[PDB]
Enzyme design. Structure first.
Site, PDB file in Angstrom:
ATOM      1  N   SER A   1       0.869  -1.190   0.000  1.00 42.57           N
ATOM      2  CA  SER A   1       0.000   0.000   0.000  1.00 42.57           C
ATOM      3  C   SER A   1       0.899   1.232   0.000  1.00 42.57           C
ATOM      4  CB  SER A   1      -1.063  -0.105   1.094  1.00 42.57           C
ATOM      5  OG  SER A   1      -2.107   0.848   0.843  1.00 42.57           O
TER       6      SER A   1
ATOM      7  N   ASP B   1      -7.974  -3.024  -7.005  1.00 36.71           N
ATOM      8  CA  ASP B   1      -7.518  -2.818  -5.636  1.00 36.71           C
ATOM      9  C   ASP B   1      -8.566  -2.070  -4.821  1.00 36.71           C
ATOM     10  OD1 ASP B   1      -4.880  -2.745  -3.888  1.00 36.71           O
ATOM     11  OD2 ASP B   1      -5.906  -0.819  -3.754  1.00 36.71           O
TER      12      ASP B   1
ATOM     13  N   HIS C   1      -6.683  -6.318  -1.460  1.00 37.32           N
ATOM     14  CA  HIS C   1      -5.791  -5.242  -1.018  1.00 37.32           C
ATOM     15  C   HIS C   1      -4.604  -5.778  -0.243  1.00 37.32           C
ATOM     16  CE1 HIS C   1      -4.371  -1.293   0.099  1.00 37.32           C
ATOM     17  NE2 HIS C   1      -4.548  -1.542   1.381  1.00 37.32           N
TER      18      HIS C   1
END
Ligand SMILES: *[C@@H]1O[C@H](CO)[C@@H](O)[C@H](O)[C@H]1NC(C)=O
Length: 356
Positions: A145, A253, A299
């Site tokens: 991330s 995502d 994710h």
């Protein structure tokens, strides 16, 4: 377990001025080092950073960090959980700077918070050199991330740091997981303010000045003053990088969908929006030779315990990473050991191996 070391240079701090640090598990006899950048969004003004300080304080301070952490996924030392690099020296660098690992500013009479992400990475590397990193053959800078974007922003600076310090034999490489975002139009307009549903171009333009954020030099020279926010978008920064970088990105995502103001029967407008997002992201990866991009709504991937399960075209991510290592040996594609793995099917979970 990985053991906490707070930085000996206590001027390199988390947002609240507490020392930054790293968790380390050494593996004697391995010359591979994995340095993983944790993610967790960002904050870009006093008000939203103050809210993050109330209810996400471990992302802004080391005062409550535990003495140990368990390595999981790619940070696991068990070959069963980590077929790729289970014997490596493992480093987990907590994200406590809220600046997508870009900042170089201290707390001062003028700054409530320090944003030192780029300096935290530099200081971790410097202190690890005395703990065995000087003997490394490969330093893989990985992250998920905001940590994945942090890899893109920092991998070439780590390479330059090691060259300047006199370690030209350490091969620096990047693994950017779930950090490859599109500066696309939202499905429905939101009025920013908050962090998750704000359009990322405006959040990052504000954050750069708030953080004194720095970007890689070649990308800075292309986009120039006032436009360095562009370098936080993988498809724009990646072509400027010299270090090898492997890109892992779900085509759908969840954080991309969040900033696009999509919240999941789907009607035609949203169907087309989602299909176009997957196609755009596939397009941006077409010329990325080392990549793994499954058609899933999910994710992050690399530090979860079941990261081994997903496959693209029958190849898992640990296998693709191993094939990438082979491709970077002293040396043409490899028989049955692919490194470019991007799904072509157009809807989430059209790949049966997607996370449940
Ligand atoms: C501590 O870190 C700061 C910021 O990177 C740097 O300017 C300074 O030289 C460092 N001091 C020591 C003693 O390492």
């Amino acid at each position: 377990d990985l053991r906490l070391h707070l930085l000996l240079n206590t001027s390199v701090t988390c947002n609240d001025g507490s020392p930054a640090g790293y968790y380390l598990k050494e593996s004697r006899g391995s010359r591979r080092w994995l340095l993983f950048l944790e993610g967790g969004w960002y904050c870009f003004n006093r008000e939203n950073c103050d809210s993050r300080y109330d209810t996400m304080r471990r992302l802004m301070s080391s005062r409550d960090w535990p003495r140990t952490r368990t390595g999981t996924g790619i940070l696991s030392s068990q070959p069963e959980e980590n077929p790729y690099w289970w014997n490596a020296n493992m480093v987990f660098i907590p994200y406590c700077s809220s600046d997508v690992w870009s900042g170089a500013s201290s707390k001062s009479e003028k700054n409530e918070y320090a944003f030192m992400g780029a300096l935290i990475i530099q200081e971790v590397v410097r202190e690890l050199l005395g703990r065995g990193l000087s003997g490394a053959k490969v330093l893989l800078l990985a992250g998920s991330s905001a940590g994945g974007t942090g890899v893109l922003l920092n991998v070439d600076r780590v390479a330059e740091q090691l060259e300047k310090l006199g370690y030209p034999a350490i091969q620096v490489r990047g693994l950017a997981d779930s950090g490859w975002f599109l500066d696309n139009k939202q499905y429905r307009h939101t009025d920013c303010v908050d962090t998750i549903t704000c359009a990322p171009t405006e959040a990052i333009r504000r954050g750069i000045r708030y953080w004194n954020g720095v970007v890689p030099e070649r990308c800075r020279r292309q986009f120039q003053e006032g436009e360095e926010w562009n370098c936080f978008f993988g498809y724009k920064v990646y072509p400027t990088l010299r270090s090898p970088v492997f890109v892992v990105q779900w085509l759908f995502d969840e954080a991309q969908l969040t900033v696009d103001n999509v919240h999941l029967p789907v009607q035609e407008g949203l169907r087309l929006y989602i299909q176009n997002l997957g196609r755009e992201l596939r397009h941006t990866l077409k010329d990325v030779p080392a990549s793994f991009a499954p058609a899933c709504l999910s994710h992050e991937i690399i530090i979860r315990s079941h990261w081994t399960d997903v496959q693209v075209k029958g190849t898992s991510l640990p296998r693709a990473l191993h094939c990438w290592d082979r491709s970077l040996h002293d040396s043409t594609p490899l028989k049955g050991c692919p490194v470019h793995l991007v799904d072509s099917c157009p809807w989430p979970h059209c790949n049966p191996s997607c996370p449940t």
